[PDB]
Amino acid sequence: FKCVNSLKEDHNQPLFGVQFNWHSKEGDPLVFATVGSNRVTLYECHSQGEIRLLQSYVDADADENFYTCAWTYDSNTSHPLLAVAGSRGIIRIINPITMQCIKHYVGHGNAINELKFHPRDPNLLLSVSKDHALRLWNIQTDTLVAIFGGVEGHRDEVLSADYDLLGEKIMSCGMDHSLKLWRINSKRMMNAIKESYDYNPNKTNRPFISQKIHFPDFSTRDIHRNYVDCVRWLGDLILSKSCENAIVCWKPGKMEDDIDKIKPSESNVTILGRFDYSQCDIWYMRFSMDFWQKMLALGNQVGKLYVWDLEVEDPHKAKCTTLTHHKCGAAIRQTSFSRDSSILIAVCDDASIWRWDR
């Protein structure tokens, strides 16, 4: 990796999220979305470092603050869609071509900190909120499938969450210092999903009933001692961080315990390694991985990039390299790899964007 370009968005507010579009068709250029201030911006990546500016969606309210975006496609037409959400607690489904808001979901009412799409179903959107809950949505039938909350749920803002490889279970984390597992392969949840696909408000009288899920299938506050601001499955293992300059790789239960045999009462965790770094004690600094999960990237609060090569027998044997530039001095809030891994983008608190080519 070498730094080939950079630029700065006119607004000067923090860029909180960047995502490449991993659903981009064969032979079109790599396109990525940034979010910050009250807008979304698409860029196209070209030779010689060029970052070709496309078009923005700018929320009507100047007080909207987008925090996160996530790419999917339309399940009938294959056209990519981009979901955005932020401080107003509104999910917006944007047509990236024209940047029209196609539709939006209210319900959270309170800030959405992260969005994720199911790894196998393009219609299933998970939002995580400042209101302590997760919601699962079916953006095909415009239904709220479930709410993951209650007193045994998170007891403070949720910051991050992630589906496992097959979308059978979710791991959430947030400001209560905890990570919670939620199975979505139960009979109940598989059936709720099925019912959400059968729902057509024009062909019936009922509202769609959401599942209230009030009991995580596992929970722990034993990994970090602060806000857990980023979470990612690595197979049956977990990669998570707080503001303590460490990504911990760990699993619920003892060393030889199966993830699918974990009862809600499980009080053990196993730590399999820890990736330490520097100058990352601020909240809401998120790492990302490439498509194959070979590598992990996190930037810190002074513009240094850390990249881990996870292509090694055990999690603790990961190989770190660092990416610095003399002009990149602002906090980096998120990174994104292209689908093919040839490009890495970092985005910063100063509205700058950094392009790193392999």
Please report the domains of the chain, with CATH numbers, ordered by start residue: 1-358 (2.130.10.10)
Q: Are 111 and 67 in contact (CB under 8 A)?
A: yes
Which pair of tokens denotes residue 12? 């000067």
CB-based burial, 205-218: b 16+ in 10 Å, e otherwise: eeebebbebeebbb
The angle formed by the CA atoms of residues 280, 172 and 286, to the nearest 5 degrees, is: 25
Tally of CB atoms within 10 A around 120: 11
Tally of CB atoms within 10 A around 274: 17
- Tell me how far apart the alpha carbons of residues 138 and 125 are, in angstroms, rounded to a whole number: 6
Burial label for 44, CB within 10 Å (0-12, 13-18, 19+), is middle
Side chain identity, residue 291? F
CA 348 to chain centre: 17
Q: What contacts 25, CB < 8 A, 6 or more positions away?
A: none
- Tell me how far apart the alpha carbons of residues 129 and 222 are, in angstroms, rounded to a whole number: 22
Q: What are phi and psi of 191, to 5 degrees?
A: -70, -40
16 three-state secondary structure: strand
- Tell me how far apart the alpha carbons of residues 348 and 15 are, in angstroms, rounded to a whole number: 6
- Tell me how far apart the alpha carbons of residues 188 and 186 are, in angstroms, rounded to a whole number: 5
Q: How far is CA 6 from CA 9, 37, 66, 68, 355, in A?
A: 10, 19, 21, 21, 6
Q: How far is CA 292 from CA 87, 211, 296, in A?
A: 31, 33, 10
Host H or E run for residue 126: strand 124-129
Q: What is the DSSP letter of 143?
A: E
Which pair of tokens denotes residue 154? 């998170």
- Tell me how far apart the alpha carbons of residues 358 and 294 are, in angstroms, rounded to a whole number: 14
- Tell me how far apart the alpha carbons of residues 202 and 324 are, in angstroms, rounded to a whole number: 56
Burial label for 62, CB within 10 Å (0-12, 13-18, 19+), is exposed
Q: What contacts 255, CB < 8 A, 6 or more positions away?
A: 270
Tokens 């919601």 locate to: 135
Host H or E run for residue 2: strand 2-8
Resolution value in angstroms: 2.6
Q: In terms of DSSP bridges, do strands 143-148 and 158-163 run parallel, antiparallel, or are they unpaired?
A: unpaired
- Tell me how far apart the alpha carbons of residues 130 and 113 are, in angstroms, rounded to a whole number: 7
- Tell me how far apart the alpha carbons of residues 128 and 165 are, in angstroms, rounded to a whole number: 19
